[PDB]
């Protein structure tokens, strides 16, 4: 792509490892830090994809 390829994603933050031959597809918010965020998708709570 001349500009970018926003088609294939990946996960950077997960709570724990996954067992062999496991598929985990989900669109959620990762509770980074000590603030219990509830979908802010902002500071100290990043999108894992």
């Amino acid at each position: 792509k001349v500009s970018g390829n926003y088609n294939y994603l990946y996960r950077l933050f997960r709570k724990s490892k996954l067992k062999p031959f496991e598929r985990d597809i989900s669109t959620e918010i990762y509770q980074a830090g000590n603030k219990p965020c509830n979908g802010v998708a902002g500071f100290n709570c990043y999108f894992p994809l």
Binding site: I25, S26, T27, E28
Partner: protein, 49 residues
């Protein structure tokens, strides 16, 4: 007739529905949001009907 498995049965993590008809069975690895449709019976007593 039916055994259901999954995680919270919400449309954020996929789940299962294994049911047994008279001579059939269907299994869906799907992400059902809701299935709570008992279709309540006004005459649930098995004595008459």
């Amino acid at each position: 007739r039916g055994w259901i498995f999954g995680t919270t049965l919400d449309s954020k993590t996929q789940s299962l529905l294994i049911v047994n008809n008279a001579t059939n069975v269907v299994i869906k690895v799907c992400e059902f949001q809701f299935c709570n449709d008992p279709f309540l019976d006004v005459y649930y007593h098995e004595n008459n009907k």
